[PDB]
Structure 1
């Protein structure tokens, strides 16, 4: 009914990004990265029962990390770093996502300040918000209890 909204982690560059329909079920996340997180996109079923394909936020290019999820496989842990890269002061530089199936996905290069959200009980990540320009300046999460 009410999602928990946590973040964002990263700098103040770029423009605010968000979703207008709260997610109910996260189906996929696609990240592009080099030495920093270059884009994020994600696909979910809204609380309205409709499917949304969000993004990409950021300029992309680099190498892809494609995370596919569903009714039983949930994101249970997300962490990363944010800091200086490519002559910018504070960018999301690295992301690590762990699902309930013990599938681990990593993007970028650890560099800067840590953040981490390990979820217990039934909590899981269902969506994102943040800031983007050419890169992902900052990232935040929506958490389904």
Structure 2
């Protein structure tokens, strides 16, 4: 139905310009899973999506090698409604310090440490977050979203 609609790219949030640019080269239509490595920090993000041609891809990891993973598997009627968190300085760079994933079914997080400036990306009504882009190094410097009608 709405899976054919074009996606909207919005963001990123966090560091204005630090880190290696990370993005995807197909248009995401469905978010299948996220793997986030975390502890006291938000270490890396990965995610699997279906594109608008129905092909599956895994992006990431974007970030460094620390932390322990959580894998969030989207249920068949589960969609991502909001990403939120905090960002702030660490060792001379601005990093995402905490992150939180709010679906229509559950909240996963917060992961990392709730310190610095808050950010939030809420998709309303007929909108869901289907993929990410951003900048990273040892941690995640900035993150943005792709948003699709559902």
TM-score (norm: length of structure 1): 0.92
Residue aligned with 1:90, SS: strand
Runs of 5+ consecutive residues of structure 2 not aligned to the other structure? none
* Correspondence list, 1:21-40, <5 A: 21-40=26-45
2:60 aligns to what?
Answer: 55
Over residues 31-88 of structure 1, what are the superposed CA-to-partner deviations in whole Å (9 max), with x where a residue is unaligned? 1123332110000111111100111011132122221114410011110111012x13
Runs of 5+ consecutive residues of structure 1 not aligned to the other structure? none
Equivalent position to 2:113, from 109, 114, 121: 109
Asked whether 1:69 is paired with 2:69, we answer no
The 1:92/1:103 distance shift into structure 2, 3 A limit, reads closer
Q: How many matched pairs?
A: 144
Distance 2:106 2:42 in 1: 22
CA contact (8 A) 1:26 1:70 kept: no
TM-score (norm: length of structure 2): 0.89
Residue aligned with 2:54, SS: coil
Equivalent position to 2:124, from 102, 105, 120: 120
Distance 2:55 2:75 in 1: 15
Asked whether 1:95 is paired with 2:108, we answer no
Residue aligned with 2:78, SS: coil
Distance 2:30 2:40 in 1: 30
2:136 aligns to what?
Answer: 132
2:24 aligns to what?
Answer: 19
**Larger deviation, residues 28-37 vs 91-100:** 28-37
